């Protein structure tokens, strides 16, 4: 049981960057839903109709 605890603690340690990336994913999808999919320009670039 002690080594099982060590394994699950190691799993908890290793996942920091991946849960941060998943949080970024979920935020991206949430704001894409919130704005109705209409995305305004924030970086200057010429466009064509």
């Amino acid at each position: 049981v002690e080594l099982y605890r060590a394994l699950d603690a190691y799993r908890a340690r290793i996942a920091v960057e991946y849960v941060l990336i998943r949080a970024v994913r979920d935020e991206i999808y949430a704001v894409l839903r919130r704005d109705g999919g209409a995305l305004p320009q924030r970086f200057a670039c010429h466009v064509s109709r």
């Binding site: 049981v1 080594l3 099982y4 394994l7």
Partner: protein, 41 residues
């Protein structure tokens, strides 16, 4: 200052052989449950 006698002394060691068989069976079972408890997901 003949075989039936020595076979009994051999059996005296075969008893310890049985004990070691039990210990190895216990070792194998312990390994199997330990591996099941930890590694499997």
């Amino acid at each position: 200052s003949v075989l039936t006698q020595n076979v009994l002394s051999a059996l005296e060691i075969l008893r310890l052989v049985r004990l070691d068989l039990r210990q190895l069976a216990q070792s194998v079972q312990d390994t199997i449950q330990h591996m099941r408890f930890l590694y499997l997901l």
